[PDB]
């Protein structure tokens, strides 16, 4: 019960197979591919949750054989948009998989996301954005972390996943193992294009402080801090 | 007597005035403007060191009037290139001044390079590498940490500059501040362009493990290890 859709147009159908692994056959992609997906709660836990992207019938690594999903009605997502829209942070403690074609993933909820233990299967990109997503007549422009003093949190456990990894939030606080192929993180009050170009800043009212502890293992990592005199903490 | 010259032709001319700083009269840069320098120990104190860089006379930060580097005919540097050749590592406890017209300035020493307090003074770039510069047919081609296990060690003091920074060694082992515009740091045992492009890599024997810990204070951080397996520890 970690995932509830919201109740309108963009709440995928959400559903618990064995031992609890979520199941969410996202819905039908717009034409620029992105499934935008919106939720009451977005939480995974150590069961996982498979997202549907299927075209055909197969067999999910998390929850067995799974049919196609017959929202993509032919076309599967090239980005899985999951936007939290109540006040309710996130929680992941386990694997979100994307089930047939690979696609990019990103998570926001500009209440705060915690990372304990959690990981990314089958994706190509996979994002944390503690901020909103700009919409501009009806097309997906970018992400928002203005106003908000919220965390980015990845406990002792850590993140894996083999794909790329952008971390966006007001400040991040790590204290686990990131395993990624890239990292990428960019802390302060920001405005971002769809690829996490920095289109505009604010200084907050407030430091906002972020601290890595723990380790990154991945050959590639980027620290943007736009907040300035705060710094990052090793 | 931090700093001490080779007895050849690319050795500066190495002096100390008022409290201890010293003052190097680097050797004339070549037609790519590289002034090549060639030491048999480099090491700053406190009192710092002043690279003479200027067509005319003037007031430097560090070391008084000093008049135009006679060494330079007419032509300042673009790249200060100051060479480790002996087995003496190398440690860093205050500033460092480009006198005159600012400059690039790197330091390779492949015996290892430890900063305690130290900085960068009108020096748009600064790189410490703990590596060797290579040369073809008389020109510098890039920088290779092959073959070598040792160690660019940051202090309690941490390091400042207003420029940009690159700390290139097979490991890096911080315990303080970097403060800089722009820190770019490469590990494992590579071959690099002019640039500090990564142009190859190689396993090394041993794990060769980079901590960073205390705090990283610049709007642009990257960290790239291509010591497969091997992390940074945060």
Do not use: W
Not at 55 to 63: I, V
Not at 169 to 187: L, M, N, Q, V, W
């Amino acid at each position: 019960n970690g995932i509830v859709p919201d109740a309108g147009h963009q709440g995928p159908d959400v559903s618990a197979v064995n031992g609890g692994t979520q199941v969410i056959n996202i819905v039908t992609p717009n034409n620029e591919g992105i499934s935008h997906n919106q939720y009451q709660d977005f939480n995974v836990g150590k069961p996982g949750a498979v997202f549907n992207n299927a075209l055909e019938a197969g067999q999910s690594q998390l929850a067995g054989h799974l049919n196609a999903n017959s929202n993509l009605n032919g076309q599967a997502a090239s980005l899985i948009l999951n936007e939290v829209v109540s006040r309710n942070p996130s929680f992941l403690l386990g694997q979100q998989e994307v089930f047939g074609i690979a696609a990019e993933s990103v998570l926001s909820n500009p209440n705060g996301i915690t990372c304990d233990g959690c990981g990314f299967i089958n994706t190509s990109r996979s994002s944390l954005v503690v901020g909103n997503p700009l919409f501009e007549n009806g097309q997906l422009k970018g992400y928002s972390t203005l106003n908000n003093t919220n965390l980015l949190s990845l406990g002792k456990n850590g993140l894996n996943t083999t794909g790329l990894l952008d971390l966006i939030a007001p400040r991040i606080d790590s204290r686990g193992k990131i395993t990624a192929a890239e990292i990428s993180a960019f802390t302060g009050q920001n405005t971002f294009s769809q690829h996490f170009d920095i289109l505009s800043s604010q200084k907050p009212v407030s430091a906002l402080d972020s601290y890595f502890f723990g380790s990154m293992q991945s050959g590639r990592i980027r620290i943007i801090n736009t907040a300035e005199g705060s710094g990052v903490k090793l």
